[model samples]
Target: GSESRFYFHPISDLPPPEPYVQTTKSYPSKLARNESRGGLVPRGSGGSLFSFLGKKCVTMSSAVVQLYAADRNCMWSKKCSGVACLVKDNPQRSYFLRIFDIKDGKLLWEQELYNNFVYNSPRGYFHTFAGDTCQVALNFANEEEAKKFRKAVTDLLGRRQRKSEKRRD
Candidate 1:
């Protein structure tokens, strides 16, 4: 008997930035059709009632932003330029902070917005992690944009937390 060989090809390409939908209640079926072309729709996941409510872009800032990553010594170092986006995943009921390269529209980095996330409005930057350890920072183009992003994340996280508490009580 011959053993079967399976060749795996890793896809290094990131999907392009999702088009911003203006209306809140846009048809999911139409959105799914568009996402299919971008290769964002999952093929073989068990059918779930809310699977169609995939990740949705809540808000996006087109202003140029900078990325910073802490080094081994925990010192922040400038990384690259990108645009910041706030995404909401309906299935997981969580929010994500995403940065995409302004030039090529490739995702530079993404982090889920958890309780540990911190935003420094005065400094116009946010840290994905709580402390100074190997954390990633996203610097916005202006304080106004940073403040706006913070408010959006705060509201989403608050709602998520409240829902969980309701379930317990």
Candidate 2:
């Protein structure tokens, strides 16, 4: 006779699983036209010339105007709604454009732009005999606001240039 052995165990017990979640990464716009002839932002003024043109903005009280900046071996200005425009030059080859609050004359914002972000205009393009012109082109419908933008950039640029010049001497 053959004998068989049988083993019995309790039913398996399992706990509920926790919920899961998935996430995705997230990531994060001017104009005017003013020409400050030759030597706008002088060469070796501590920053590379972004383009080939003239430059700043100083005390614009009129309505906001679009700010457009294009320079070479010189400097250009930006428009803003502030008191003073300033450019901070760094030895790291990075530059910062600072704007001040015109309301109370206080520093407002600063933006650091590297060569990687700067644009150099194409050579051999003869658009003007002077090779450069400054003028903010926009319909009057939006010219008022643009004027402010223009003034801000230029004023701040001017402030920085003058300030830098004095600092240099």
Candidate 3:
């Protein structure tokens, strides 16, 4: 809806995350309170998970970042449009974990930063499969930029986490 954001959690593991990490991971321990992002939507942009997004001529090297927005695709069996002011039950307050990736979607290396953020135009090269993954791992040169990005993630997910905690408690 707006500019992207997240909370910074200095990465511990190296790049190329395991393949099993594909499935959805929920926060709250309580099953009843949790909802699946993928369960919400019917369809979304068919962007390649491992390959580069945008401009057919663009090289994978040209890509810099990958984004994962808070999923709210599970309403009335419809997918999220990703704009700010949707009339539907948009999870007004939620968090997202964005990670960085390379060599297509196969080998991911970034961690999830918990915080709130918005998605940019297709220029950001975002991809989603029924809100299951609004995933895109952005590439950066130095740790500073990476952490900055991470910080934003931390905030967004952190906020979403705290909110869920309150509800659960």
Candidate 4:
């Protein structure tokens, strides 16, 4: 007869089993719009345009609109709710339209497009900003507001074209 050794080990003696954990992970909402026009942010050992010094902001009133800008490229106009409209020229390959807040230093938004490229009817497009949508659209509700907005948009576009000409020279 073969004798078999049998020993019962205590369950408590066993190493504690891996604990079960219930973790909740939420995903961030993707911004809807074609952001490809803008340059991509640097990843892995690189940085974003904001990383540059001085170009980030300036706090002086613009000679044209009389709104203070942190830099010449930025504008502190009330039309944009203290968010200055700025331009960032990228090697003339890609131009960025910067809309950011001066006080909080928050970059609200930006649009990137080919440099010196004029979209159809600049002023008409400018009036589009008068719309309620965060993205500007032409508003024709109030007669007075529409007139003024259209005029302002036209003037602004004209000024931009004039300046563009001067710069091109």
Candidate 5:
């Protein structure tokens, strides 16, 4: 047995420090990424898609634009987002053809832009919303392309809008 060791307190004497935590939630905001936006690119929010209906198409991860199949039956769909929307068509300049998915969550539940179809959210709502509401007649560059897009769009409408738009044979 050791004789005279200095008196020592047990190591567990210190009290646990009070803990602090933080949380966060998000909402929508109105913004744009037009050519005049000082060349500033908008923020990409979600996962990305590079293909839609057998053609090269890209759109933002989060931004969504709704578009309808005007040429065919009263059909509808959504434009993926701004960045990915028309980039595939042309990078330097934007094109009209885009993608939209109702299956995926987006703003303004229940088609608000009935007359038109694509609404690029973060890419300019106020300025472009009014005009972009309507979808272009969607003329596939070729007949095969047309068929491909049409069939895909039909399925999209059925799934998203809950309307089994009759497919043309």
Candidate 6:
């Protein structure tokens, strides 16, 4: 004869935990698409760009010059002039540091904030290192702006570390 009632097992006896799932958050202006190319233009006066593309601009600094060097001792040369922005992607819950060219408002390069470090120098420039092989520098208009940009990156990195730890546990 079969038993009429079933016994419950302990939580520890269950199977291994499944991977974490992230749900996408919705925003009001997130779906609308504007046809005018005028919004894509980068103003010479300095301001945020590509806000209509669903990327939330956390902080932005203008008159930024991208720099690159062949080696540690090599002189850093200017690559291009653009605006640096820290943008937040809601769907992925990730952050990216993006540079948009000042001329036509095109994306020059982008670096994800995960596992990255920002170093500020005494001069008006700051360096971003992605592990050992990848590194880039951005020269701000002045020291004050460089300090402010560094602070913003550090603050966001701190929050990201905490959130990642929580997910693991």
Q: Write the per-residue lDDT of candidate 1 for residues 12-128, one digit (tens) a residue.
A: 121111221222322233333232233357464333444354444444323345666656543555566666677665444555567777687888677665543435443423433
The reply for model 5, stretches above 4 Å from the true place, is: 1-135, 160-169
Q: Model 5, range 47-146, lDDT digits (tens) per residue? A: 3343332232332112223332322323323233211122212221122234444465332222211211232222111112222223232211123323
Evaluate all candidate structures by whole-model CA lDDT and list the values in order. Answer: 0.46, 0.28, 0.28, 0.27, 0.26, 0.44
Counted clashes in each candidate structure = 0, 30, 38, 12, 19, 0
- Please provide, for model 3 over 1-169, each residue's C-alpha lDDT reduced to its tens digit, 9 standing for 90 to 100: 1124532222222132222224454433222233434434654444333332122211111223433333233212111112111111113223323233434444333222222233222222222211224433332223343343333334434443322221100
Candidate 4 lDDT at 112 equals: 43
TM-score on alpha carbons, each prediction: 0.51, 0.25, 0.26, 0.26, 0.20, 0.49
Per residue, candidate 6 scores C-alpha lDDT tens digits across 1-169 of: 1123322223223222222122322222222332223344653433334343433434433335443422333334445556666655533345566777778688777766553344435452344333223335655444455565565566655655222111100
Error of 3 at 23 (Å): 6.0
State which candidate, 2 or 4, has the greater TM-score: 4
TM-score of 3: 0.26
**lDDT at residue 23 of model 1 (Cα atoms):** 28
Candidate maximizing TM-score: 1
Enumerate residue pairs that collide in model 1. none
lDDT tens readout by residue for model 2, 40-129: 566333343534322332222332112223244333334434332324342322234444544655555444432222122111110010
Please, what are the lDDT tens digits per residue for candidate 4 over residues 17-122?
A: 2211223221111211123333457433332343322222212111111111122222222323223233323223222334454465566644442222322222
Provide C-alpha RMSD values for all models, in order.
19.2, 27.4, 18.1, 28.1, 25.6, 22.8
Best by lDDT: 1
Cα lDDT for residue 159, candidate 6: 56
Candidate 5, residue 55: the lDDT equals 30
Q: Any idea how many clashes model 2 has?
A: 30
- Is 1 or 4 the stronger prediction by TM-score? 1
Model 4 segments more than 4 A misplaced: 1-80, 115-126, 129-169
